[PDB]
Amino acid sequence: NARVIELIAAYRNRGHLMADIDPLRLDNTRFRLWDLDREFKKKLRDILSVLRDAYCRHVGVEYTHILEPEQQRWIQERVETKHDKPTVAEQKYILSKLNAAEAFETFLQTKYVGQKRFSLEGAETVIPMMDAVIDQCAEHGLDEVVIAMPHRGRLNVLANIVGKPYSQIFSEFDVKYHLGATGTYIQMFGDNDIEVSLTANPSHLEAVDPVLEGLVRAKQDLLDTGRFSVVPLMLHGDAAFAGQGVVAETLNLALLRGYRTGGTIHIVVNNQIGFTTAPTDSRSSEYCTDVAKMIGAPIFHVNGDDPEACAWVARLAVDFRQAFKKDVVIDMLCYRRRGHNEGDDPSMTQPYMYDVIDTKRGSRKAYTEALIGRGDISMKEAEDALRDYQGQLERVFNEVRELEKHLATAVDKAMLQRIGDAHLALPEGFTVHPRVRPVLEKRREMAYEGRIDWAFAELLALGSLIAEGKLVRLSGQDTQRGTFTQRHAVIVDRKTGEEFTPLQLLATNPDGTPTGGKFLVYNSALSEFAAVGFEYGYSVGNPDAMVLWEAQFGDFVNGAQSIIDEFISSGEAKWGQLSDVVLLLPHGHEGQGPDHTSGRIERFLQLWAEGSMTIAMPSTPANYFHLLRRHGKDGIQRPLIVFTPKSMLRNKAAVSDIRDFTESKFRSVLEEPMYTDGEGDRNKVTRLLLTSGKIYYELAARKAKENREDVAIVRIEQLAPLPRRRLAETLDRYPNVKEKFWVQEEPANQGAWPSFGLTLPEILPDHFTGLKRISRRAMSAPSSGSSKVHAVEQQEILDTAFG
Amino acid sequence: KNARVIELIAAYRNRGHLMADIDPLRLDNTRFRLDREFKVVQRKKLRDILSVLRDAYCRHVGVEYTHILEPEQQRWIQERVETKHDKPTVAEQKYILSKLNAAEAFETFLQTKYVGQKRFSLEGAETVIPMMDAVIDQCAEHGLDEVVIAMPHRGRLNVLANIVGKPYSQIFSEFDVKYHLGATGTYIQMFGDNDIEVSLTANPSHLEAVDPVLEGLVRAKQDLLDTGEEGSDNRFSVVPLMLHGDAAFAGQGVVAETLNLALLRGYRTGGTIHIVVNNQIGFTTAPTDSRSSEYCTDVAKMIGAPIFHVNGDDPEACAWVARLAVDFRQAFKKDVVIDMLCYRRRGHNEGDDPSMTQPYMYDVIDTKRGSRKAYTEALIGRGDISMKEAEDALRDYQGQLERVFNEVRELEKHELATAVDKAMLQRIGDAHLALPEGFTVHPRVRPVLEKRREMAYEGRIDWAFAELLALGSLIAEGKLVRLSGQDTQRGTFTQRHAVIVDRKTGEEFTPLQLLATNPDGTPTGGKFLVYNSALSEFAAVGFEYGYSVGNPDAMVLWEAQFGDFVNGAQSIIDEFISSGEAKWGQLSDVVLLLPHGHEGQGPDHTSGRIERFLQLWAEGSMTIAMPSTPANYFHLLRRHGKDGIQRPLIVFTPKSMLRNKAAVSDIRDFTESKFRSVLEEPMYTDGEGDRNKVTRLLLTSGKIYYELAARKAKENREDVAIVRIEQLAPLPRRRLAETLDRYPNVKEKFWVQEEPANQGAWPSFGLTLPEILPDHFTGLKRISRRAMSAPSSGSSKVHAVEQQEILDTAFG
Ligand SMILES: Cc1ncc(C[n+]2c([C@H](C)O)sc(CCOP(=O)(O)OP(=O)(O)O)c2C)c(N)n1
Ligand SMILES: Cc1ncc(C[n+]2c([C@H](C)O)sc(CCOP(=O)(O)OP(=O)(O)O)c2C)c(N)n1
Ligand SMILES: [Ca+2]
Ligand SMILES: [Ca+2]
Ligand SMILES: [Mg+2]
Ligand SMILES: [Mg+2]
């Protein structure tokens, strides 16, 4: 009886190593008491039969790694029971899905050339599997299923899952393998319907994974679900799932209050190959899905030649996700019938795999034959299924044949005061930390008396948008408090730890009615790639939301370079996909080293093309306030890249008056206040210094010290698109200028000079011919490691500018 | 009856760690909420079985091992953890105490002497010093050669003084970059007669980015010692010791990517010892906002690594677990993870009052005495040391505190031809046909082998063979050549065949490996290491960079599938490759091969982003090239391997140009030439072309030369000359000036490129060329694709119209 308990556990824990999951059976070595009629606390023979049928057939179940005992028991109870065999109607429906999938693959490989790399041949069982996921989500009465996938079988998914007509898919035939889509799934045997959408993606495998999560979360927030009535269905390749780090980063978001989507259904199209590379060179684990153990997700390894087991596992996966709001991974073992592309004979690199693959008949033929052998379908019914295949193959050829034949951002002072007062409108019994208390009181003072600092200006911009009814999502590393202890968007009760969000009071009107707005502010995980991916995705999911991601320091945003390059900077031109995502990048030379100095302005300026992004480096709190309000209210979906301050947050010269918020607008170009408001004479100016950011204050302090009336400092607040007209009109007001200099803190090969030094004399030749540069010398790093070297270099720039 | 006992044993083994007293702060208040003999074959009283299970799984060590698929590994851990362990000797306890004394004294000095050092404080986590000491001592006990450490900034200088053994005079000299520099030392056993080398690798502030770099460096050192995967012995005598933070370990994707390399034939280092300094905080962020798993180390389950969660206030358990981790790694050549639960005594940096965001954690922390005082007190309670001995431990603490204050005070008072012979070419050609007895060549690979023998003897050498001629000749000269990347053995474009596969057995054959043996039969000292990489960019590039640091005499090449995917490794490019030399004095000779070219395959199969590498470049940091001929690529690789200078090389390599019949080279280009940074048209250097007829000069780089040359030939345009810039960085100023001076009647000059106006070489050349050579490039104009937000159009129809528009503009 003790040997039985240890045997039951052996099947539950390790039974999946004996499971018949590989349709190619490449591993020969894989499968290599007599008192069975004795009753145990059920007869041993009946215990072993249940254990073999549940754990050693076409499904390999991995679940004993799960720490929650209720989750282990849930799987156990559903897997260790005598399952009701599918009805002939359900079997015929699965067969019709295989018929449609294989007829689409036959057409693709016959009608067009160069389509072999998109081939789903050897993996057509993923179509009835995805169909069962979506149908089971419809059965749960859910609202939408959003899909992210690589290029393999994407057009088959468009036709047989999303339900896109052939006329739309094969219109002016590629970019079609990277575009988004929307459709409606209607249940076959049920009375429910569900929305099905496919998100756009680059060729960069797995990069879309966090983008899907953000998009689904934005949709869930709009529907007020999380319920979690919007389901992410994420498809993968076996080599990419095990090798791409973004997979682990996206899994790590699955249960976070700021990023959870109530569980993702993962489908790995495990064709046991990655171009020419064997699994043994692609991963250090038994399974390509072993990374999912990181969050204790249940994993089901299923034989891709058994579409009934695949459909059953898909439905069980949806039920688990609904019950525990956690990720489920389906590892579908299949094969890639043809080579990776046109110039590939896969027996050059994988002779053994492809000698076995050459003897394989399709999943459709195998399933049709297995249904005859089992006596589930008659010869007429098998013949009718073959008619259905031919008819489906004819329809796509025929339908395609017919296709071929044919605003003010200023707020009222009462708005500033309301946001100010909100910082003191504390809940009953709330204990503020003694060091947070002066920050709340100073904000009430600033709101009524002026000298508004950068940190408060940001909250005035965000707070006024929430008051106007906008959803504001703000996140990043330690973003609630702020890296530089300046934000305090969330304050923590000194005795209970209860969080209080002052800006959330602006979601309610003075009369007590909701504005429709909301403030969602989170501390992110220590991720850049997945967090930026998520935020980009969130802005796509809800175009009406104000979405801001904040880097700890701009220097760490290179960890999210694939998102910047493949989605943010180029998604609009490539896919017509629009994003209003904001990236806040703390930037500035202060002597803290090459990883706490630059958000790499030069790289964002290099990526920029007409109307793709807005790139700014504001120097005043009011200009930042108007930049965020213009972004949220301009009705245009364009990413905004902001180079934000660090020490300039506390510079007492970098403060703004209430009138700058109430009676002004965003200024792309800024002159010195002595010329616009003071008694300064523009006609005395012979040298013009053009700059951006905090170095203005150091240049202005030096000018004041030596009383240099012959020098003027002009700031370019909007770096991209270049404010050509505002720039020209500003410089025209200084007629006696004999020399012009672009002054920057960044090395010569960095900052704005590489692009401005080439663009400014071309766009404005009567103004910038002969433009010279004052900067740090060109460097292989964003700065020196020494704060002593930094300090000498900073002084050398100021001395050169006034020499 | 005994079924409730078998179920109890399994429950403690599987889930005991969930009840183990691992948190020294005890923040979770919900966490912790007989005399009959049983068969276990041995007969033990139920009380004795339960006491063994409680001590093993529910004390100060939480053991996670039942997830391991190998039964022998599960049994090994079980046998060592479920035994009545011999308590450490008073001498061993006093030695652990002396390590805590030294660690805490270093920390107290660091906060008192200098300002702005709070962010690198190890207070609340000093137990990592006797833990690291036990790792290194246990590696010395196994007679290993070296322990190579990678870590973030927290406790770095303490590790330098108390682990690496660097003197204070060296540590606080010209006192920051010191928290990022590499170091080397010798660890000498206290209680033994063994010694071991201890080194610390350089790293940026980018947490976890150094993880694959450490692996690459260790692997290079193992290959040099002929230990491990490419060695005669299975000792893997160089041990990676990788330190982490709890928030970074769970959130950074490079962790999973590096763990995925642990057992790969091309990347394994025989197991890494991981130490997570789990201070249960990440700046102001709580674990519940940093991970979706019970533990920060749950990612390590991915490779079935054993995980030990240990209480940082128990340095005995920490030392014991460290020694067990080294023994497991030696027995199974697999990763071990130590999750050391501790706390961060101070705020994250100066000014930070941590009770603002974590009031509860920091009210508990304020009541906590140090790990040192805790261990001194716990030894008194156990009766292991007397009151006098406890007072001497406090005097050893004061003496250590005085020594560092005094030592630093005293410090302040005092302060080649690349051409080969035709016989070399022929030998590499013949090697492609020198097949092992019984080997079956796939019928489609056989002509490639026969064509390479014909190329070596008769010329018209293509790009793919030229690469193997450079690599093969270096191996023949005694150089180690490491080449890897996605499908690099065969080649993405089916052009390489560095490894060929037996049609019947699947056995691999490497033709270039025959060149590691001289014609007499003696070894050359060279070797060819060629691998297919995992589907990773960040970890694979990190690894290859690290490998070139570990063996500066090796030729290390990493090949991107397409240059477009190298942005996945941007942190390595930015933080190590382009800038490691200027920041840390750390040198790398790593080569990046990036398939590049506009051919209508879309924005992710077109560009390796030349403009970004050119933007990163600064005098003497990297070499950036886009060769147009096979012989020039051959001489570029040979120059790089033989220059005696450690500097990264970035090569933009071809795709369709691999099979362009005009892009072939003669034997004389390999045997009687050198690398040419600037190339003229052969009609001027070898033909009957007249340079004086030229009025328009087109400056270009790469495959567009052939299209421009074909158009010139078609219209017989004697008035137009095409000059190629093969070396993009550093700009070949002298060669470029001398070349253009040979065309006196030139009235207009154009930089012609395939890439959009905001991409390619134009953003830097358009600004630098008129400045570096004003008498030659004043008035230089651009012919290119329009500026774009992506590297190209998604349409091959649009690409084709744009390609023709460039050629027509160049000859209009
Ligand atoms: C991040 C990134 N790095 C590399 C590539 C290049 N790349 C591809 C092409 C050439 O673009 S396909 C491919 C192998 C895919 O292996 P898998 O996951 O087993 O799938 P499959 O069997 O369904 O194909 C790679 C490696 C990429 N797309 N993205
Ligand atoms: C990749 C990347 N993204 C962000 C940062 C910024 N950054 C740091 C500074 C300000 O640069 S420290 C830090 C928190 C570290 O948390 P941990 O791992 O729990 O450790 P600890 O408790 O031992 O400190 C972060 C998040 C970084 N360095 N690298
Ligand atoms: Ca907008
Ligand atoms: Ca070199
Ligand atoms: Mg695959
Ligand atoms: Mg930490």
Side-chain angles (χ1 to χ4, degrees), chain B residues 357-368 370-387 389-390 392-394 396-409 411-412 415 417-436 438-452 454-495:
Chain B
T357 45
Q358 299 301 337
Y360 177 62
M361 168 174 267
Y362 283 82
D363 283 334
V364 172
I365 282 169
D366 288 359
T367 69
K368 281 230 79 116
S371 150
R372 168 191 63 99
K373 283 167 78 70
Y375 187 53
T376 308
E377 280 163 8
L379 284 165
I380 301 154
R382 271 188 289 200
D384 301 356
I385 66 164
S386 65
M387 208 70 193
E389 287 179 313
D392 303 342
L394 297 154
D396 174 65
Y397 165 74
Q398 191 52 42
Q400 285 275 30
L401 189 52
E402 262 179 289
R403 185 169 72 91
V404 56
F405 257 115
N406 292 330
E407 281 197 6
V408 169
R409 203 175 65 244
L411 175 67
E412 299 184 294
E415 73 191 335
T418 61
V420 296
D421 192 84
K422 295 178 183 169
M424 179 77 262
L425 298 187
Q426 289 168 5
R427 197 164 189 250
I428 299 160
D430 291 336
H432 280 83
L433 294 172
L435 294 155
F439 201 92
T440 320
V441 192
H442 187 284
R444 287 192 214 262
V445 179
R446 194 201 62 110
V448 188
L449 311 177
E450 287 165 353
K451 191 60 203 176
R452 281 181 180 163
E454 192 201 357
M455 281 183 313
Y457 283 77
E458 332 272 344
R460 286 198 84 260
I461 299 151
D462 56 24
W463 185 282
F465 187 41
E467 187 182 81
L468 300 177
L469 286 165
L471 301 184
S473 61
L474 288 163
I475 292 149
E477 286 163 358
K479 212 173 178 72
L480 187 141
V481 173
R482 185 182 153 102
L483 169 66
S484 65
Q486 281 148 32
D487 311 285
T488 286
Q489 290 184 343
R490 193 211 61 175
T492 300
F493 312 93
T494 327
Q495 83 288 5

Side-chain angles (χ1 to χ4, degrees), chain B residues 75 105 131 156 170 205 225 251 276 289 292 383 404 464 503 514 537 576 605:
Chain B
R75 207 187 327 272
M131 186 190 281
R156 178 138 192 145
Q170 269 183 65
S205 295
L225 279 165
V276 182
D289 283 334
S292 285
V404 56
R503 186 55 191 83
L514 295 163
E537 284 81 28
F576 290 96
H605 298 93

Side-chain angles (χ1 to χ4, degrees), chain A residues 134-139 185-190 192-193:
Chain A
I134 292 157
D135 181 78
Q136 198 66 14
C137 291
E139 204 58 28
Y185 180 96
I186 305 167
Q187 285 194 309
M188 179 64 63
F189 307 102
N192 294 280
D193 56 56

